[PDB]
Design an enzyme around this catalytic site. Sequence first.
Site, short mmCIF file in Angstrom:
data_model
loop_
_atom_site.label_atom_id
_atom_site.label_comp_id
_atom_site.label_asym_id
_atom_site.label_seq_id
_atom_site.Cartn_x
_atom_site.Cartn_y
_atom_site.Cartn_z
N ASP A 274 0.81 -1.22 0.00
CA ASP A 274 0.00 0.00 0.00
C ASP A 274 0.83 1.25 0.00
OD1 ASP A 274 -2.11 1.62 -0.17
OD2 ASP A 274 -2.97 1.17 1.79
N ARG B 275 -0.23 8.92 1.03
CA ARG B 275 -1.05 8.94 2.25
C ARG B 275 -0.38 8.05 3.32
NH1 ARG B 275 -3.63 6.35 -1.79
NH2 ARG B 275 -3.50 4.07 -1.54
N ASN B 276 0.49 7.17 2.84
CA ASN B 276 1.07 6.10 3.68
C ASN B 276 2.52 6.37 4.00
OD1 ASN B 276 -1.15 4.50 4.39
ND2 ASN B 276 -1.12 3.48 2.40
N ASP C 147 3.70 4.82 9.65
CA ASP C 147 3.10 3.82 10.55
C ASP C 147 2.04 3.04 9.75
OD1 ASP C 147 2.25 2.35 12.80
OD2 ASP C 147 0.94 3.97 13.53
C1 LIG Z 1 -0.27 12.12 10.69
C2 LIG Z 1 -0.29 13.28 11.34
N1 LIG Z 1 -1.20 14.22 11.05
N2 LIG Z 1 -0.90 15.22 11.91
C3 LIG Z 1 -1.62 16.48 11.93
C4 LIG Z 1 -1.09 17.36 10.82
C5 LIG Z 1 -1.76 18.72 10.85
N3 LIG Z 1 -3.22 18.48 10.78
C6 LIG Z 1 -3.73 17.67 11.92
C7 LIG Z 1 -3.09 16.31 11.76
C8 LIG Z 1 0.17 14.98 12.72
C9 LIG Z 1 0.58 13.72 12.37
N4 LIG Z 1 1.62 13.09 12.93
C10 LIG Z 1 1.62 11.76 13.31
N5 LIG Z 1 2.81 11.25 13.66
C11 LIG Z 1 2.81 9.97 14.02
C12 LIG Z 1 1.66 9.23 14.03
CL1 LIG Z 1 1.77 7.59 14.49
C13 LIG Z 1 0.48 9.84 13.69
C14 LIG Z 1 -0.83 9.16 13.63
C15 LIG Z 1 -1.10 7.81 13.66
N6 LIG Z 1 -2.47 7.62 13.49
C16 LIG Z 1 -3.02 8.83 13.34
C17 LIG Z 1 -4.38 9.23 13.12
C18 LIG Z 1 -4.66 10.54 13.01
C19 LIG Z 1 -3.59 11.50 13.12
C20 LIG Z 1 -2.32 11.14 13.32
N7 LIG Z 1 -2.03 9.81 13.43
N8 LIG Z 1 0.44 11.12 13.32
#
Ligand SMILES: Cc1nn(C2CCNCC2)cc1Nc1ncc(Cl)c(-c2cnc3ccccn23)n1
Length: 300
Positions: A155, A159-160, A173
């Site tokens: 995948d 987005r990934n 992740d």
């Molecule tokens: C993926 C991601 N989105 N964001 C924000 C960017 C600005 N808008 C709001 C979202 C910060 C992260 N960073 C991040 N880093 C590590 C992980 Cl592991 C994750 C993560 C894992 N599952 C989700 C689900 C929703 C948002 C973030 N994550 N996100």
Amino acid sequence: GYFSADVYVPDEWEVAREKITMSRELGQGSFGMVYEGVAKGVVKDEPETRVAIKTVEAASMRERIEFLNEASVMKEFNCHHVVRLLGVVSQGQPTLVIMELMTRGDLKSYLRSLRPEMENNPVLAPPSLSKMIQMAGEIADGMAYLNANKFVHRDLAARNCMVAEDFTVKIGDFGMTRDIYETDYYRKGLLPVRWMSPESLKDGVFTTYSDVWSFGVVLWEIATLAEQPYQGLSNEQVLRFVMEGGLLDKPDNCPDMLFELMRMCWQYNPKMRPSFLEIISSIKEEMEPGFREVSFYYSE
Ligand SMILES: Cc1nn(C2CCNCC2)cc1Nc1ncc(Cl)c(-c2cnc3ccccn23)n1
């Protein structure tokens, strides 16, 4: 008769809850809400580290067990170009998984944020060849590492991937943006058909060589700032087009070289595509100097 029950087994990744603090919510995943925060003593020689905290409480035990085992997949990876698992809090509730923080989010979202808004305001120019190549090599390096570790991704897509504070791009992740970008999938099994190799559209099998194909598409993603591939084509029409040797168009103002790279990845015959290692080799001269120090490619 029969063979008997799913568990989570604490290990060396287990971290003390009292060492963790959460603040700003980043969003919501399948298993629950995801937060930004601070973890103490989870990176060597760092008293404190900014992290991402995935949570499950409400939730059933079957559910939180499954969230635990799935997240754990990331435990066997140690690569600068792959988002790290930093710890787990499985003792007590709520259930936590501590991850490397990627402040600038998923690459598809980062890419879209660079689109000029429809106001009259000054705007940063589209990403340069050089920056685009930097991303391509980081992504490729993570993929090479994954491959050498016997993995097939299946995948691979913007987005990934995620994007760090310092703009470093990394293999994301596993499984964290699927539902969010649901239109990027089609129930041919919910599959990312616009990112799929011809051979995979045929027999449903994925290889490293079909991960390269998707990498090609990820580069196209970068060049178009995250437009939907085969934009005008229905899901069904994509299958035929791609299986029949059809190809994505050179984006407006895409530098020749990046398109050439894409082109090498979209070769019909999987055996004629460059490996990830080969890809990196072709563009190493273009990589930021520090790539020697951090990359799988240049490592022992
Ligand atoms: C993926 C991601 N989105 N964001 C924000 C960017 C600005 N808008 C709001 C979202 C910060 C992260 N960073 C991040 N880093 C590590 C992980 Cl592991 C994750 C993560 C894992 N599952 C989700 C689900 C929703 C948002 C973030 N994550 N996100």
